[PDB]
Design a protein around this ligand. Structure first.
Ligand SMILES: Nc1nc2c(ncn2[C@@H]2O[C@@H]3COP(=O)(O)O[C@H]4[C@@H](O)[C@H](n5cnc6c(=O)[nH]c(N)nc65)O[C@@H]4COP(=O)(O)O[C@H]3[C@H]2O)c(=O)[nH]1
Lengths: 170, 169
């Protein structure tokens, strides 16, 4: 069951190293984006395409997701989200790199690892990660989505607004 | 059972990316080391301390393993192995980084992951990796060892066994 370990290693070996510093860096940044003319969500957003298809470049993949800026120090990028050519949201967005690992396996013959299997481990990966995140010492949402009526910018824009509702409320 | 996935990811995500190129790079190098004057084993050697203790610097750890050179995104280092202050062998030596992951877990409270567990997953990691390596498309040995024994000697052991197998078959 490879997903169990990929999840842990991604957390222990990556997430728990950037996320502490995260919301500071974003806060530090956000001053100027205010002055220059918007805000950047405080959570890191992670794309979990259950297809395990990670583009080498996210912006070219979805038209409505333009690159905007690199966040100052670990390499993180601020994307703007679009509606009608209008800036509609802005966050730090990333792909869960361990999917690349599940995808390479399903193209590795001696692995005997099928797409059947890969989708299964993908969901498992997503599940187990979420649990890890639950007990961890909130600046980090998981966005699992099965490519089909579906705009990726919209799924992201959805969470994005839900984040701002929770802030002004609680 | 975290070891199953760590193993695979280490292979798919690291090993199978450097090992193809490996033995060329070493061969390319080895000409000069001849002229300058020894040889460098053709396999990449991977340290699996079952304690999961990866020093930030290997040479400082064992006195008998001195750094010698970087081999020309992939960062690899040639070490010389010592006996009596004499150069006794020379290879590219590395620590299996996924152990660091097993060790961090056993110090992460909400993991509930014990040294009991860690040693278990370590061996498992070593086992499963070896199997992966078995069916893979030979420039790469695993050196699992439980600290109690002179590291350099365990490495020197394999090192010579490698040169035996070459001149024979
Ligand atoms: N966006 C992003 N994601 C990151 C970054 N660092 C790690 N990750 C993610 O973390 C996973 C596990 O990392 P690991 O614990 O360091 O565990 C690593 C490590 O043990 C080994 N490894 C990978 N690259 C190197 C390398 O260049 N040198 C050495 N010595 N080992 C490496 O491969 C293991 C797992 O392979 P991966 O497939 O790469 O899987 C990685 C990858 O999905 C990063 O800087 N940015």
């Amino acid at each position: 069951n490879v997903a169990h370990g990929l999840a842990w290693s991604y957390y222990i070996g990556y997430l728990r190293l950037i996320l502490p510093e995260l919301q500071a860096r974003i806060r530090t940044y956000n001053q100027h984006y205010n002055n220059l003319r918007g805000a950047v969500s405080q959570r890191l957003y992670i794309l979990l395409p259950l297809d395990c298809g990670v583009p080498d470049n996210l912006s070219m993949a979805d038209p409505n997701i333009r690159f905007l800026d690199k966040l100052p120090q670990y390499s993180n990028s601020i994307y703007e989200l679009l509606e009608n050519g209008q800036r509609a949201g802005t966050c730090v967005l990333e792909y869960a790199t361990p999917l690349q690992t599940l995808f390479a396996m399903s193209q590795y013959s001696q692995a005997g690892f099928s797409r059947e299997d890969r989708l299964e481990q993908a969901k498992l990966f997503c599940r187990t990660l979420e649990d890890i995140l639950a007990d961890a010492p909130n600046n980090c949402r998981l966005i699992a989505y099965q490519e089909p009526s579906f705009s990726l910018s919209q799924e992201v824009l959805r969470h994005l607004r839900q984040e701002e509702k929770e802030e002004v409320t609680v």
